[PDB]
Amino acid sequence: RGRIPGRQWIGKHRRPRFVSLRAKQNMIRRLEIEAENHYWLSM
Amino acid sequence: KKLIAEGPGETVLVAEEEAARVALRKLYGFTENRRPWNYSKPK
Amino acid sequence: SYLPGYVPKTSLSSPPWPEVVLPDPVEETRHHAEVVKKVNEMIVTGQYGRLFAVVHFASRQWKVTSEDLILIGNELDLACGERIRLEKVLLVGADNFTLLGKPLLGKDLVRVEATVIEKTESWPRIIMRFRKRKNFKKKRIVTTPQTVLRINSIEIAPCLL
Amino acid sequence: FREVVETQEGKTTIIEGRITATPKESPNPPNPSGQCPICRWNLKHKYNYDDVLLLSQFIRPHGGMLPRKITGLCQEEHRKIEECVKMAHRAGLLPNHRPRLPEGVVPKSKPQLNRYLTRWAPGSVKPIYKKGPRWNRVRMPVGSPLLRDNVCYSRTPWKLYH
Amino acid sequence: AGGQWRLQQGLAANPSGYGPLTELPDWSYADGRPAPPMKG
Amino acid sequence: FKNKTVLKKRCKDCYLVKRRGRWYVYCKTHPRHKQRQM
Amino acid sequence: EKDIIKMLGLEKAHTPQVHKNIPSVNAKLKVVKHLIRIKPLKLPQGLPAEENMSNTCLKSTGELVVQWHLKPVEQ
Amino acid sequence: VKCTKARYLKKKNMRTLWINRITAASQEHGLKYPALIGNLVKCQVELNRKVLADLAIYEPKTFKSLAALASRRRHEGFAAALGDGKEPEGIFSRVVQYH
Amino acid sequence: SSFSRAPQQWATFARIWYLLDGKMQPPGKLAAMASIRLQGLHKPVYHALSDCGDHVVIMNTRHIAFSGNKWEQKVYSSHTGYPGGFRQVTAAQLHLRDPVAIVKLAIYGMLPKNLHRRTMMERLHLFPDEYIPEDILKNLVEELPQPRKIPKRLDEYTQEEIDAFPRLWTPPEDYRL
Amino acid sequence: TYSPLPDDYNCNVELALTSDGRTIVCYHPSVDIPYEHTKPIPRPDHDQVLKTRLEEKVEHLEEGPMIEQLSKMFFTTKHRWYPHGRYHRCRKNLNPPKDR
Amino acid sequence: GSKAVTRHRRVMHFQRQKLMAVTEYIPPKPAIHPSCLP
Ligand code: FES
Ligand SMILES: [K+]
Ligand SMILES: [Mg+2]
Ligand SMILES: [Mg+2]
Ligand SMILES: [Mg+2]
Ligand SMILES: [Mg+2]
Ligand SMILES: [Zn+2]
């Protein structure tokens, strides 16, 4: 039981992917670098 | 009541004999961790 | 008899770990000098046997002792029999004491010498690539120059102050 | 507190109530501004199901909870203690607060299973016969969500579902 | 391990970067003469 | 008992009780009002 | 975005490159701002001279020092 | 082809082995692996995992000293974090600056 | 150490016997501890092919405690192989049938899924109560600390501890508690 | 009284810094086992007219019983005890290299 | 593929899922719960 129809990560019905805590922290870490890039490009 | 030597073994007799060898090595200065032989040119 | 931040004792009132009280820096500075003096006297009086050292050489670290062999994975431009000093010593250890660099020990403190005893090449190393159904196949053989070093002596000087 | 004694003398029943000794709150609470017993002693978020010394003050002699109007607890804390007491009973930490049994009732022996952090009543829960896929796994709840805000001394947060 | 900490001390995140551990000569002649500079 | 996703009291004598992990509507006056959470 | 990375000399990752802080350069940097880290070059001892050209080191703080002794600070 | 690709795994597996061995030695002294490695770096001790694993096996007294040093540096970190800056830097927390 | 070569090797690779008390302990934490010891992962000389695992003796496995409602919810599934042979039992049912099965299954699932696993299980000695055979009792070396601290029941608190905890509220004198 | 680690099992660790602060000195003498913490070694283990002779009690066991005995004695599975074929026996290196 | 407007809630690209997770509303949390103060 518990089959995903067709291929897992494409199509209409897909296997749900969830966002882990460290995935969030990774994204926020790069958001901080880009925010600082904005600043040093302002002068 | 002071530990001169200690030896491992698979039997008490074997362990006791090994401990005697360890004590002899310490008494005679042939310990595994003794100062290595000096091969440097004589001064 | 209750301070403003007093909490009754519960399973979560305080942290699980025990409280640690570190020594007074002034009192510990005096204790440190005593320890250093004691170890220094052991060096002066020669109260050590075989020494070992951790040396950084050719990008990597080697735990060594007198009479050891180490296989350097490159050529060194030295004739066989030439004696050299290993200048990057991270650690020197004895039965009863150990000295640690931050990250490297001073050259006055420890001297590690070694001798080139062989200059050769490694056995043949096959490099082959293959991708199925793509007529993609290639083979290369490489032999890497090597140098064998013998550690002759590890000596320490009473320069701990 | 107030007791009640029923005495039948000469085919006559007399119902009377007497005032017994009453315990008093300890003096000088560390946070007099607090609006309930919990925050008056800076205990908010700092107690658990096994803190029977705390929990036992808010329960009846037979293990029942006391009304919130009497204790003075706030709804938030009153609900936390309510769940904590249920878990304390189920863990066997309140052996002197058992239910009242009528005369002539000796409970039949029942299998002893040591348990703790038991959210639900054992009899009301069904087996997890079908666990489900990893992305839709049926989980076994542990502890209570009411205590999610308790002080966490570890870097990992409390896992409430196993 | 420790990359962020090293950066906070003004050091290279990787200890293989700049500093005495990498740049100083690996060896010298026993007599005292310095070795030819390393290729890296 | 009729299975219901939404439990509703149908008279003043209906009372909501949670038993065996689910909510029930019980009514002594009109037993037909009895409902089980689905 | 691939082509601007080449134009800025950033083909190899984690390899610092120095660029002029001017509108034209900034215009390119903005296209690829999500791919790079921008920090100001700091010159605590001024610009390198001909005498000290060979003794410079770019630290992780962004300061380009003109003396690199590889020795501990006596202070 | 297997022989060629195995050169990557050999390096990977060796480091995994060192971490397992270092983890075991650290637990004997009540320290978790991340606590030992992290705090040794903060003491400017750059011993790599290969040497650390060798020390655990053949130099157990030196390893306990390293474990003690890491434990000491770890406690100094806690004291600093709990303080508001009033306290001076820990004796083992001072960093040797190079230029 | 200055030992002879053969005694030196014998000592380093010797098998230690550990004792673990399962009373009021969750089987998973017991299993995590036993698994490390049975594999040899607690030794700096560890290597997969060094067959360096130790003996683990777990007593009082009848008195393990699950958190939550795992007694009712956790199901153990097996299949005899015959049509209709699928069997599912709750942890409670299995425990009363076999007072060592739960701990044994928890350990078995944590060990590496290779041919060494069944050899490691031969070094595991599970006992439901506090009775341990004399031979096994004689070879024990060290008892491992229990992973879970057992909470005290209200009747186990000393009057000093009870007196130290403050009274938090004043009940009304006219309330029938 | 502060000690980073307990000093009662392996060695007495004392950590110190040099005055310059560039070297960490670690003094770690060994701790000897106390005499009180030891046990005594168990040295302690008729008009027979006829010389007592050695009696062979090594009755041969069949493969199954023998393997069960060995597996129980060494706490192993039966598999290790069964023989292997000629192909594997002749592949084993009988003069393997020896480091020390 | 599926059109931009669907009857079901279309699965998002993983990067977009992460974006949503990182930009969720965080309410202002007071130092002391207002119910615990006069
Ligand atoms: S009013 Fe403070 S916790 Fe209830
Ligand atoms: K699909
Ligand atoms: Mg498919
Ligand atoms: Mg790697
Ligand atoms: Mg198509
Ligand atoms: Mg489309
Ligand atoms: Zn009704």
Side-chain angles (χ1 to χ4, degrees), chain C residues 24-69:
Chain C
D24 184 1
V26 170
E27 174 184 0
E28 216 191 321
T29 304
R30 293 195 313 255
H31 169 67
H32 281 192
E34 290 167 7
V35 167
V36 174
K37 170 165 287 195
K38 179 199 317 175
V39 171
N40 205 56
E41 291 177 350
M42 293 169 73
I43 300 169
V44 178
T45 57
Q47 297 174 25
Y48 52 93
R50 175 178 285 278
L51 297 181
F52 67 93
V54 176
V55 302
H56 183 288
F57 193 88
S59 75
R60 81 186 73 261
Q61 303 180 14
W62 308 83
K63 170 172 178 315
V64 296
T65 189
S66 295
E67 307 146 14
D68 289 345
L69 300 176

Short mmCIF file of all heavy atoms in Angstrom, two decimals, chain C residues 24-69:
data_model
loop_
_atom_site.label_atom_id
_atom_site.label_comp_id
_atom_site.label_asym_id
_atom_site.label_seq_id
_atom_site.Cartn_x
_atom_site.Cartn_y
_atom_site.Cartn_z
N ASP C 24 39.70 30.76 39.97
CA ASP C 24 40.01 32.18 39.94
C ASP C 24 41.18 32.42 38.99
O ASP C 24 42.22 31.76 39.13
CB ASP C 24 40.35 32.66 41.35
CG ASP C 24 40.59 34.16 41.43
OD1 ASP C 24 40.48 34.85 40.40
OD2 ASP C 24 40.89 34.65 42.54
N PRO C 25 41.06 33.33 38.02
CA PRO C 25 42.19 33.52 37.09
C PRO C 25 43.50 33.88 37.77
O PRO C 25 44.56 33.41 37.34
CB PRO C 25 41.68 34.65 36.17
CG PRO C 25 40.58 35.31 36.93
CD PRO C 25 39.92 34.19 37.66
N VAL C 26 43.46 34.71 38.81
CA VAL C 26 44.70 35.07 39.50
C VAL C 26 45.31 33.85 40.16
O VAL C 26 46.51 33.58 40.02
CB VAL C 26 44.43 36.19 40.52
CG1 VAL C 26 45.65 36.42 41.41
CG2 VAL C 26 44.05 37.48 39.81
N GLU C 27 44.50 33.08 40.90
CA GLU C 27 45.02 31.89 41.56
C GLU C 27 45.48 30.86 40.53
O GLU C 27 46.48 30.16 40.75
CB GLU C 27 43.95 31.30 42.48
CG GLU C 27 44.33 29.97 43.12
CD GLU C 27 43.20 29.38 43.95
OE1 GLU C 27 42.13 30.02 44.03
OE2 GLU C 27 43.39 28.29 44.52
N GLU C 28 44.76 30.74 39.41
CA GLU C 28 45.13 29.76 38.40
C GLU C 28 46.40 30.15 37.67
O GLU C 28 47.18 29.28 37.27
CB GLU C 28 43.99 29.57 37.41
CG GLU C 28 43.84 28.14 36.91
CD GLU C 28 42.89 28.03 35.74
OE1 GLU C 28 41.85 28.72 35.75
OE2 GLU C 28 43.18 27.24 34.82
N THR C 29 46.63 31.45 37.46
CA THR C 29 47.87 31.89 36.84
C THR C 29 49.07 31.42 37.64
O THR C 29 50.11 31.06 37.07
CB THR C 29 47.87 33.41 36.70
OG1 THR C 29 46.72 33.83 35.96
CG2 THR C 29 49.13 33.89 35.98
N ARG C 30 48.96 31.43 38.97
CA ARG C 30 50.05 30.94 39.80
C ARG C 30 50.19 29.43 39.70
O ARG C 30 51.30 28.90 39.65
CB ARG C 30 49.83 31.36 41.26
CG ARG C 30 49.92 32.86 41.49
CD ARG C 30 50.06 33.19 42.96
NE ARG C 30 49.09 32.46 43.78
CZ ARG C 30 48.01 32.99 44.32
NH1 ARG C 30 47.70 34.27 44.17
NH2 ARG C 30 47.20 32.22 45.05
N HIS C 31 49.06 28.72 39.67
CA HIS C 31 49.11 27.27 39.52
C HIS C 31 49.71 26.88 38.18
O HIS C 31 50.47 25.90 38.09
CB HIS C 31 47.70 26.68 39.66
CG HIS C 31 47.60 25.24 39.26
ND1 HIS C 31 48.22 24.23 39.95
CD2 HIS C 31 46.95 24.65 38.23
CE1 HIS C 31 47.96 23.07 39.37
NE2 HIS C 31 47.19 23.30 38.32
N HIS C 32 49.39 27.63 37.12
CA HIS C 32 49.94 27.32 35.80
C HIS C 32 51.46 27.43 35.80
O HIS C 32 52.15 26.58 35.24
CB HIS C 32 49.34 28.25 34.75
CG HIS C 32 47.96 27.84 34.31
ND1 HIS C 32 47.34 28.40 33.21
CD2 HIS C 32 47.09 26.94 34.82
CE1 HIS C 32 46.15 27.85 33.07
NE2 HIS C 32 45.97 26.97 34.03
N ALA C 33 52.00 28.49 36.42
CA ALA C 33 53.45 28.65 36.46
C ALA C 33 54.11 27.48 37.18
O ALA C 33 55.20 27.05 36.79
CB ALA C 33 53.80 29.97 37.15
N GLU C 34 53.47 26.97 38.23
CA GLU C 34 54.03 25.82 38.94
C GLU C 34 54.07 24.59 38.05
O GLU C 34 55.07 23.86 38.02
CB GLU C 34 53.20 25.55 40.20
CG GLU C 34 53.37 26.61 41.28
CD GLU C 34 52.32 26.50 42.37
OE1 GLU C 34 51.55 25.52 42.36
OE2 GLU C 34 52.27 27.40 43.23
N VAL C 35 52.99 24.33 37.31
CA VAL C 35 52.95 23.17 36.43
C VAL C 35 54.03 23.29 35.35
O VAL C 35 54.73 22.32 35.05
CB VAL C 35 51.55 23.02 35.81
CG1 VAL C 35 51.56 22.04 34.64
CG2 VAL C 35 50.55 22.58 36.87
N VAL C 36 54.17 24.48 34.76
CA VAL C 36 55.17 24.67 33.71
C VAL C 36 56.57 24.47 34.28
O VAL C 36 57.43 23.87 33.63
CB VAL C 36 55.00 26.05 33.06
CG1 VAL C 36 56.12 26.32 32.07
CG2 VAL C 36 53.65 26.15 32.37
N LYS C 37 56.82 24.99 35.48
CA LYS C 37 58.13 24.81 36.09
C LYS C 37 58.42 23.33 36.36
O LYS C 37 59.54 22.86 36.14
CB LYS C 37 58.22 25.61 37.39
CG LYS C 37 59.46 25.31 38.22
CD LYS C 37 59.69 26.36 39.29
CE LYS C 37 60.19 27.67 38.70
NZ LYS C 37 60.75 28.58 39.73
N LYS C 38 57.42 22.60 36.84
CA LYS C 38 57.61 21.18 37.12
C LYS C 38 57.96 20.41 35.85
O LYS C 38 58.89 19.60 35.83
CB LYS C 38 56.35 20.60 37.77
CG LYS C 38 56.42 19.11 38.09
CD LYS C 38 55.04 18.49 38.31
CE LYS C 38 54.11 19.37 39.16
NZ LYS C 38 52.74 18.80 39.24
N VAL C 39 57.22 20.66 34.76
CA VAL C 39 57.49 19.96 33.51
C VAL C 39 58.84 20.40 32.94
O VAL C 39 59.58 19.59 32.37
CB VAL C 39 56.35 20.20 32.51
CG1 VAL C 39 56.72 19.67 31.13
CG2 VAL C 39 55.07 19.54 33.00
N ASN C 40 59.18 21.68 33.09
CA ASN C 40 60.47 22.16 32.61
C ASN C 40 61.62 21.44 33.30
O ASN C 40 62.61 21.08 32.66
CB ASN C 40 60.58 23.67 32.82
CG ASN C 40 61.54 24.32 31.85
OD1 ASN C 40 61.40 24.20 30.64
ND2 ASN C 40 62.54 25.02 32.38
N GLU C 41 61.50 21.22 34.61
CA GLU C 41 62.55 20.52 35.34
C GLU C 41 62.69 19.08 34.88
O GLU C 41 63.79 18.52 34.87
CB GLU C 41 62.28 20.59 36.84
CG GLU C 41 62.43 21.98 37.43
CD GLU C 41 62.10 22.04 38.90
OE1 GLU C 41 61.57 21.03 39.43
OE2 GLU C 41 62.36 23.08 39.54
N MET C 42 61.57 18.45 34.51
CA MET C 42 61.64 17.09 33.98
C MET C 42 62.46 17.05 32.69
O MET C 42 63.16 16.06 32.43
CB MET C 42 60.23 16.56 33.73
CG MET C 42 59.42 16.35 35.01
SD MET C 42 57.68 16.02 34.69
CE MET C 42 57.76 14.35 34.06
N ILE C 43 62.38 18.10 31.88
CA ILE C 43 63.17 18.17 30.66
C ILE C 43 64.64 18.38 31.00
O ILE C 43 65.52 17.72 30.43
CB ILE C 43 62.64 19.27 29.74
CG1 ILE C 43 61.18 18.99 29.36
CG2 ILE C 43 63.49 19.38 28.48
CD1 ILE C 43 60.48 20.15 28.68
N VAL C 44 64.93 19.29 31.93
CA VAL C 44 66.31 19.57 32.30
C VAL C 44 66.97 18.32 32.87
O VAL C 44 68.13 18.01 32.57
CB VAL C 44 66.38 20.74 33.29
CG1 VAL C 44 67.81 21.00 33.73
CG2 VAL C 44 65.79 22.00 32.67
N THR C 45 66.24 17.58 33.71
CA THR C 45 66.77 16.40 34.37
C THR C 45 66.63 15.14 33.52
O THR C 45 67.04 14.06 33.97
CB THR C 45 66.08 16.19 35.71
OG1 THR C 45 64.66 16.09 35.51
CG2 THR C 45 66.37 17.35 36.65
N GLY C 46 66.06 15.24 32.33
CA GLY C 46 65.95 14.10 31.44
C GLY C 46 65.05 13.00 31.95
O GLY C 46 65.35 11.81 31.76
N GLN C 47 63.94 13.36 32.60
CA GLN C 47 62.98 12.37 33.09
C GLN C 47 61.92 12.08 32.03
O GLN C 47 60.72 12.28 32.23
CB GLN C 47 62.35 12.84 34.40
CG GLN C 47 63.34 13.01 35.54
CD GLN C 47 62.70 13.62 36.77
OE1 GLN C 47 61.49 13.52 36.97
NE2 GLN C 47 63.51 14.25 37.60
N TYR C 48 62.39 11.59 30.89
CA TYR C 48 61.51 11.12 29.83
C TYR C 48 62.24 10.05 29.04
O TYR C 48 63.47 10.05 28.95
CB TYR C 48 61.06 12.25 28.91
CG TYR C 48 62.19 13.09 28.35
CD1 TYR C 48 62.74 12.79 27.11
CD2 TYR C 48 62.69 14.17 29.05
CE1 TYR C 48 63.77 13.55 26.59
CE2 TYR C 48 63.72 14.94 28.54
CZ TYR C 48 64.26 14.62 27.31
OH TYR C 48 65.28 15.38 26.79
N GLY C 49 61.47 9.14 28.45
CA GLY C 49 62.04 8.10 27.61
C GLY C 49 61.84 8.39 26.14
O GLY C 49 62.34 9.40 25.63
N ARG C 50 61.11 7.52 25.45
CA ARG C 50 60.84 7.75 24.04
C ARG C 50 59.80 8.85 23.88
O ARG C 50 58.80 8.90 24.59
CB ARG C 50 60.35 6.46 23.39
CG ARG C 50 59.91 6.61 21.94
CD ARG C 50 59.48 5.28 21.35
NE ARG C 50 60.62 4.41 21.07
CZ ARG C 50 61.37 4.49 19.98
NH1 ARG C 50 61.13 5.39 19.04
NH2 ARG C 50 62.38 3.64 19.83
N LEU C 51 60.07 9.75 22.93
CA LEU C 51 59.16 10.84 22.60
C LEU C 51 58.46 10.54 21.28
O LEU C 51 58.99 9.83 20.42
CB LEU C 51 59.91 12.16 22.50
CG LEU C 51 60.61 12.68 23.76
CD1 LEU C 51 61.29 14.01 23.48
CD2 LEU C 51 59.63 12.83 24.91
N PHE C 52 57.26 11.10 21.12
CA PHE C 52 56.58 11.11 19.84
C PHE C 52 56.17 12.54 19.51
O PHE C 52 56.10 13.40 20.38
CB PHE C 52 55.35 10.19 19.84
CG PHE C 52 54.23 10.66 20.74
CD1 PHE C 52 53.21 11.45 20.23
CD2 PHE C 52 54.19 10.29 22.07
CE1 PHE C 52 52.18 11.87 21.05
CE2 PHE C 52 53.16 10.71 22.89
CZ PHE C 52 52.16 11.50 22.37
N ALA C 53 55.92 12.78 18.22
CA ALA C 53 55.54 14.11 17.76
C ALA C 53 54.53 13.99 16.64
O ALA C 53 54.52 13.01 15.89
CB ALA C 53 56.76 14.91 17.29
N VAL C 54 53.68 15.01 16.54
CA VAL C 54 52.79 15.18 15.39
C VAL C 54 53.36 16.32 14.56
O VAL C 54 53.44 17.47 15.03
CB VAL C 54 51.35 15.48 15.84
CG1 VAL C 54 50.46 15.76 14.63
CG2 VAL C 54 50.80 14.32 16.66
N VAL C 55 53.74 16.02 13.32
CA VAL C 55 54.38 16.98 12.44
C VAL C 55 53.51 17.16 11.20
O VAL C 55 53.00 16.19 10.64
CB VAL C 55 55.81 16.54 12.04
CG1 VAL C 55 56.67 16.35 13.28
CG2 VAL C 55 55.77 15.26 11.22
N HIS C 56 53.34 18.41 10.78
CA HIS C 56 52.70 18.73 9.51
C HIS C 56 53.76 18.71 8.42
O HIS C 56 54.73 19.48 8.48
CB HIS C 56 52.00 20.08 9.57
CG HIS C 56 51.26 20.43 8.32
ND1 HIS C 56 51.90 20.79 7.15
CD2 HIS C 56 49.94 20.49 8.05
CE1 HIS C 56 51.00 21.04 6.22
NE2 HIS C 56 49.80 20.87 6.74
N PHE C 57 53.59 17.84 7.43
CA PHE C 57 54.54 17.72 6.34
C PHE C 57 53.80 17.32 5.07
O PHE C 57 53.01 16.38 5.09
CB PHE C 57 55.63 16.69 6.67
CG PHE C 57 56.81 16.74 5.75
CD1 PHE C 57 57.88 17.58 6.02
CD2 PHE C 57 56.86 15.94 4.63
CE1 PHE C 57 58.97 17.62 5.17
CE2 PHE C 57 57.95 15.98 3.78
CZ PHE C 57 59.01 16.82 4.05
N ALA C 58 54.07 18.03 3.98
CA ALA C 58 53.48 17.74 2.68
C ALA C 58 51.96 17.72 2.76
O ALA C 58 51.29 16.80 2.28
CB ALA C 58 54.02 16.42 2.12
N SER C 59 51.40 18.75 3.41
CA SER C 59 49.98 19.04 3.52
C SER C 59 49.29 18.23 4.61
O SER C 59 48.18 18.58 5.00
CB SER C 59 49.21 18.80 2.20
OG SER C 59 49.02 17.42 1.97
N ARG C 60 49.90 17.16 5.12
CA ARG C 60 49.23 16.24 6.02
C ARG C 60 50.04 16.05 7.29
O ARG C 60 51.21 16.44 7.37
CB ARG C 60 48.98 14.90 5.30
CG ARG C 60 50.16 13.97 5.24
CD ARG C 60 49.82 12.76 4.39
NE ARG C 60 49.79 13.12 2.98
CZ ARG C 60 48.69 13.39 2.28
NH1 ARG C 60 47.49 13.33 2.83
NH2 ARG C 60 48.80 13.73 1.00
N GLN C 61 49.40 15.46 8.29
CA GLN C 61 49.98 15.31 9.62
C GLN C 61 50.44 13.88 9.84
O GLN C 61 49.80 12.92 9.39
CB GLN C 61 48.96 15.71 10.69
CG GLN C 61 48.45 17.13 10.52
CD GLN C 61 47.44 17.52 11.57
OE1 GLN C 61 47.28 16.84 12.59
NE2 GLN C 61 46.74 18.62 11.34
N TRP C 62 51.57 13.74 10.54
CA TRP C 62 52.21 12.45 10.78
C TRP C 62 52.53 12.34 12.26
O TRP C 62 53.24 13.19 12.81
CB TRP C 62 53.50 12.31 9.97
CG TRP C 62 53.36 12.59 8.50
CD1 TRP C 62 53.39 13.81 7.89
CD2 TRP C 62 53.24 11.62 7.46
NE1 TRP C 62 53.26 13.66 6.53
CE2 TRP C 62 53.17 12.32 6.24
CE3 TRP C 62 53.17 10.22 7.43
CZ2 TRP C 62 53.04 11.68 5.01
CZ3 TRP C 62 53.03 9.59 6.22
CH2 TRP C 62 52.97 10.31 5.02
N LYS C 63 52.01 11.31 12.92
CA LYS C 63 52.44 10.98 14.27
C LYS C 63 53.68 10.10 14.17
O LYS C 63 53.62 9.00 13.61
CB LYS C 63 51.33 10.28 15.05
CG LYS C 63 51.80 9.70 16.37
CD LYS C 63 50.64 9.19 17.21
CE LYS C 63 51.12 8.57 18.52
NZ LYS C 63 52.29 7.66 18.33
N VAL C 64 54.80 10.58 14.70
CA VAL C 64 56.10 9.98 14.44
C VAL C 64 56.84 9.76 15.76
O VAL C 64 56.49 10.30 16.80
CB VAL C 64 56.96 10.83 13.48
CG1 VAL C 64 56.31 10.91 12.12
CG2 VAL C 64 57.18 12.23 14.05
N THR C 65 57.89 8.94 15.67
CA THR C 65 58.80 8.70 16.78
C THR C 65 60.11 8.20 16.18
O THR C 65 60.16 7.82 15.01
CB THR C 65 58.23 7.70 17.79
OG1 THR C 65 59.06 7.65 18.95
CG2 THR C 65 58.09 6.29 17.20
N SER C 66 61.16 8.23 16.99
CA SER C 66 62.48 7.84 16.51
C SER C 66 62.43 6.49 15.82
O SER C 66 61.82 5.54 16.32
CB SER C 66 63.47 7.81 17.67
OG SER C 66 63.66 9.10 18.22
N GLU C 67 63.10 6.40 14.67
CA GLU C 67 63.26 5.21 13.84
C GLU C 67 62.04 4.93 12.96
O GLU C 67 62.05 3.94 12.23
CB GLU C 67 63.55 3.94 14.67
CG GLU C 67 64.73 4.09 15.62
CD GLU C 67 64.55 3.32 16.92
OE1 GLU C 67 63.64 2.46 16.99
OE2 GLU C 67 65.32 3.57 17.87
N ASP C 68 61.01 5.77 12.99
CA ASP C 68 59.85 5.55 12.14
C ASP C 68 60.19 5.78 10.67
O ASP C 68 61.19 6.42 10.33
CB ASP C 68 58.70 6.47 12.55
CG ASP C 68 58.08 6.09 13.86
OD1 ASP C 68 58.33 4.96 14.34
OD2 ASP C 68 57.32 6.91 14.42
N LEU C 69 59.34 5.25 9.81
CA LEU C 69 59.37 5.53 8.38
C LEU C 69 58.05 6.17 7.97
O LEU C 69 56.99 5.82 8.49
CB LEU C 69 59.59 4.25 7.56
CG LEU C 69 60.89 3.48 7.82
CD1 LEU C 69 60.91 2.20 7.00
CD2 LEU C 69 62.10 4.34 7.49
#
